[PDB]
Amino acid sequence: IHHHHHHMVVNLEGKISKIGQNMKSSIIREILKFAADKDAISFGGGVPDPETFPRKELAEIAKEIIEKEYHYTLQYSTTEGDPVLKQQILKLLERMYGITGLDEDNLIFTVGSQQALDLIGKLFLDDESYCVLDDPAYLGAINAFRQYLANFVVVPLEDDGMDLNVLERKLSEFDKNGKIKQVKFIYVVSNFHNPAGVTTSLEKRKALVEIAEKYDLFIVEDDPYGALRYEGETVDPIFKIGGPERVVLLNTFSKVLAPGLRIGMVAGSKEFIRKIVQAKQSADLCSPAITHRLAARYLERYDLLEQLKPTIELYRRKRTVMLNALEEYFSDIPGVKWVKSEGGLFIWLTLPEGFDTWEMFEYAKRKKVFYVPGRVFKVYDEPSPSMRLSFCLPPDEKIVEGIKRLREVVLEYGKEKHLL
Amino acid sequence: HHHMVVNLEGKISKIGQNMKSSIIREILKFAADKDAISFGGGVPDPETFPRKELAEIAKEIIEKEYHYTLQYSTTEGDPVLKQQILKLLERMYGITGLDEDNLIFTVGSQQALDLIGKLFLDDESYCVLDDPAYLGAINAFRQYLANFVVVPLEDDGMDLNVLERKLSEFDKNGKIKQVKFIYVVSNFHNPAGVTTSLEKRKALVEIAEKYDLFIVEDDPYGALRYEGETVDPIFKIGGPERVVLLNTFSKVLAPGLRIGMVAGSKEFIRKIVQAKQSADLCSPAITHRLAARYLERYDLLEQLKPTIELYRRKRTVMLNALEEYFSDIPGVKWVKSEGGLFIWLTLPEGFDTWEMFEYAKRKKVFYVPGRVFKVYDEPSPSMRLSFCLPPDEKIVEGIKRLREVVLEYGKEKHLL
Ligand SMILES: *Cc1c(COP(=O)(O)O)cnc(C)c1O
């Protein structure tokens, strides 16, 4: 009534920065909205099983540290992070990976490894910069980086890691056009990739360090899942191979302790870490001291690597159930393939050419079986015949039943499209 | 060679280049020494925290509510907490008419400042703030290459004559679209201690409406009032279409929870959700649910009373000591704060509280030099003092130390 206000809205939308205009929302929650319905079976999870968390122990420690250590735990803390937790982290890295030679100034804690990704983006990426990552890649990293108007150099991922031939070709092109200064870093997930379940070979790890050196790049090694190994041996981290001069290591408590703590660990050069401290201080002053000290006391009192063993046994069992069900129900469709993940939370399944797992998702919802369509993990959002599956949450019998439902989905959709 | 350090510095973005570290950590490095007395703190006294109440609740929500507290949560924040905030806003300020989609929780009010800056500021944008201003806002905004319209702060708030003159100049040069918002701290200013009068609050809303700006009202301290009556928030006057309201649990419950409350229009909040999700996915559910069950179970406004008695006592001891020990020094003034954590003191013309800091360090007495709160880093005769942490006897001893410093420096400068 000449009061079409919304105009106030267009004025606000008018005030939004370029970063603001280039922000993306994850659609995962929307599409998994009904995934917990009674007769639904969901493989769309990206999370650990909460039934595995040491809740009684964390609860007792939480009370104790608030009551007795409140001068630390309820008060503002340093941006640099809890030095008691730092001691425990330095110990874990040495016990887990044989990483040695670091001190407290090589580390900082973030609000998840997500904040680390966001702050690395903020400090290093702009509309004139490039970052190198996989196809497929972790969604959090794509969204954290793309908001800063970054350009991407996308390299296809193979069963043993990134295709280093493609990587070298692309980098060579940048060099020949005198644009290699615009390329900043390579983002990798070296153990049990999200979404691909792939583990980067030692030889490709070493080769990545060499390529980074040649083109004066650093490497951001995101490693949420390394402790969750079901077979084989732990591979040296890229961080151990290149050192903090060349590599930033991101670990998290999300997958091995509790997402709710929101604790990411960043290890790097003292110069790099000083810059993350500056960025984090303007971003949130500090992390909640409550979370840091809780984790720190837990780790002092319980050996995480030991306490993980029954959780590893459980996830291994479930991984094997899914891989067996895949072999039983997906072995007669030519062109189907999947990564036989040796750790972590995911199996990445790829259907034959022509299959579009986004288009197919309607048939899946109709059968109440859920996965993450592969397009979600593509920087440029093109159609995908792949999907991410997680075996972590459903009970064994539902893993088998869910995989049978997916077969039915594939057959229905495949036949409607004259692919089968 | 070690100068791939140079390569890394070459890789850093413009935002990364325009980033200011806080100096306060550096200047207060030795302020916890044995014989030292510090007025430099900007933090509450941990001896006032409801540590027993919070500890019990923490155990309960981790053990019994773990599906919520130990798992990822929504970026939007805990709805249980949101229902308590809606109640509190009404009981504290008489604010009504909001729902959950007008709220989000951030990792302190600091993250809210950072996300507002990210979303609204860039090298072609301006925001309006006070001289002096809160350092956390200065640093959160400057990182995004923002230009500042700085307005002198008077004892009852911003000089609005200056504000309207400067915005008029923008408007006359057709640049008013580049001005995004006005940042204010309406109760018990950090660092100034001042409270904006209701008249200036209403006028601020009019100006913002006239020039199509929004107002970011940062209010950490409103509940720590030692005398007088609570004033209507700017948010209550302009509403969510015009104003974003920032509250925090830091000064009234516990800084270590890292909980800022942001209230605004549903469109604004949705953009904040989008920005937060890429920044950190979500805040720790443990912190939110802890605060929620605390507020359900204990009346914060009642639990604050002994805290207010303590702080008010210390405040008066400091003012009384300033009276005793600065009475005979012409030109010195200070804000007789009625709330919050700070007294803002100004020395005579010619005194430079940065220069003078070396004499203070020598007497082992600490303050925050006023230049820290100045966007353009020019010399200041002022300093921020806090009365929260030192025991009463050290408040007196410390103010006497400060007198001796002012006299030592002033004599050397031939100002006294
Ligand atoms: C799960 C995951 C994360 C977890 O992020 P947090 O913020 O630490 O909880 C980070 N990176 C990758 C590759 C992941 O899969």
Ligand SMILES: *Cc1c(COP(=O)(O)O)cnc(C)c1O
């Ligand atoms: C104390 C203070 C803050 C509180 O910061 P948090 O990040 O919520 O802990 C914010 N704004 C002002 C003006 C302050 O004085």
